[PDB]
Design a protein around this ligand. Sequence first.
Ligand SMILES: Nc1ncnc2c1ncn2[C@@H]1O[C@H](COP(=O)(O)OP(=O)(O)O)[C@@H](O)[C@H]1O
Ligand SMILES: Nc1ncnc2c1ncn2[C@@H]1O[C@H](COP(=O)(O)OP(=O)(O)O)[C@@H](O)[C@H]1O
Ligand SMILES: Nc1nc2c(ncn2[C@@H]2O[C@H](COP(=O)(O)O)[C@@H](O)[C@H]2O)c(=O)[nH]1
Ligand SMILES: Nc1nc2c(ncn2[C@@H]2O[C@H](COP(=O)(O)O)[C@@H](O)[C@H]2O)c(=O)[nH]1
Lengths: 215, 216
Amino acid sequence: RPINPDVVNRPLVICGPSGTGKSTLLKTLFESQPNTFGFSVSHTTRKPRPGEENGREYHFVTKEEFMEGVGKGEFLEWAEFGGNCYGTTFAALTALHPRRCILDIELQGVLQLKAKAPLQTPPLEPVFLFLSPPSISQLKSRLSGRGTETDASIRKRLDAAKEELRYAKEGKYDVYVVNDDLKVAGEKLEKVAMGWEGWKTCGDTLPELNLAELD
Amino acid sequence: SRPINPDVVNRPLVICGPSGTGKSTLLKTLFESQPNTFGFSVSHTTRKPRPGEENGREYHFVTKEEFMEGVGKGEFLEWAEFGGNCYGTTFAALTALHPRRCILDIELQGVLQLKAKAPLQTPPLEPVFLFLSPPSISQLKSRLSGRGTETDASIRKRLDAAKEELRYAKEGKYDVYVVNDDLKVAGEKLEKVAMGWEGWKTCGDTLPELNLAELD
Ligand SMILES: Nc1ncnc2c1ncn2[C@@H]1O[C@H](COP(=O)(O)OP(=O)(O)O)[C@@H](O)[C@H]1O
Ligand SMILES: Nc1ncnc2c1ncn2[C@@H]1O[C@H](COP(=O)(O)OP(=O)(O)O)[C@@H](O)[C@H]1O
Ligand SMILES: Nc1nc2c(ncn2[C@@H]2O[C@H](COP(=O)(O)O)[C@@H](O)[C@H]2O)c(=O)[nH]1
Ligand SMILES: Nc1nc2c(ncn2[C@@H]2O[C@H](COP(=O)(O)O)[C@@H](O)[C@H]2O)c(=O)[nH]1
């Protein structure tokens, strides 16, 4: 079944608390639908993880290089997260044509894109998908289980999750998916990414996440 | 005194330095000494006002969502995050100052952005970048705590930021360095630079030896 023409030019923006499973789910999608999606390679000033390569998951740059690019107008959006800078360059999106663009960004980037996308020529109409953990306890077990972050970074990431989840609870994302069972969540992501009939209503109710557990 | 040098009127003076060094203190005296000469760029920030601050004077105080909407709409010449809050210079804030010489109080990320962005404006913008240094790390800490407006967590973030700010400053790339030791001495140098009076390019200080490990 082919990708819906009505979503090919609508970038799919996936966001959610660190550790929820964004990278893991995207890998299942690209395996299930090869040569269909383009993953936007963001710039970041954080250091690479063992499984990461420069030019694959991120373009890893220094803070001075990052801010030079910002001043040069190279970024569609950028923001600071957990003490490091991240952003989507125009060139990273251009590199993905003609596949449907997929971006993995956080809330400040989402807010920028909601303002900026209508002002592009031609206007861009992203789809904003929020990927939720099934519980805060599972979020913490996944984030610590990944084993790539310092204790200081985990604290910053859990603190950021408070504002990310607070915004998510306002109901403004286009689709919500709870990443409980990987296969069930992956099937929903595939439906959303392919734009198949029913994708807008294929999503989940946000769980009752008491944010005080993030303290 | 003599009028402002025409050669610097259209060169924005960008002042930066570690939080607590004395930027606001010195600028307040500069503007009282030279009224109707300078325009102070009113940045946007998402931090909360301090007791002695008024919306529209020191800052345009906005929410984070308002700030990011403005960013996405292209309203900012530069912006950055500092100490967990956002700050930025809107194009409209500088337009509001013409024809006065623009004075900006921004941090290092904004400086780096402007160094890349100013040459690309039409016409090109040629700022003067001034670094204001504390005389010692111990005096930076006592000034920052003595102001009495920040939480302990905010002080920690500001001192941590000072490490990167001073590391960059030590590279020697600023146009002028002024050590804020004696307020009157530093004020005279700042006025000379802001007015562009003869000698301003050579009036600056050598950056002191500052042990950045003391910031912890
Ligand atoms: N549905 C799931 N069930 C169990 N573990 C999962 C699931 N999804 C992801 N994980 C694991 O959780 C951790 C965080 O996933 P990751 O994709 O790195 O998150 P993110 O990109 O959102 O920060 C990884 O160790 C990953 O293998
Ligand atoms: N030269 C100086 N000597 C002693 N204290 C100073 C001096 N300059 C400023 N201060 C004090 O240090 C504190 C920080 O000054 P401020 O102007 O608010 O710093 P900044 O704007 O760089 O963050 C204030 O309490 C101020 O009165
Ligand atoms: N705004 C923005 N956030 C990004 C970008 N790239 C990654 N992020 C976000 O930064 C956070 C941290 O990513 P990580 O360090 O775990 O790879 C995640 O929420 C991720 O979505 C980007 O290009 N822009
Ligand atoms: N980049 C940038 N930094 C700013 C701006 N306004 C204030 N800052 C910087 O933010 C830091 C904190 O400012 P404060 O909270 O003490 O007023 C200072 O270093 C100040 O120069 C702005 O418009 N842009």
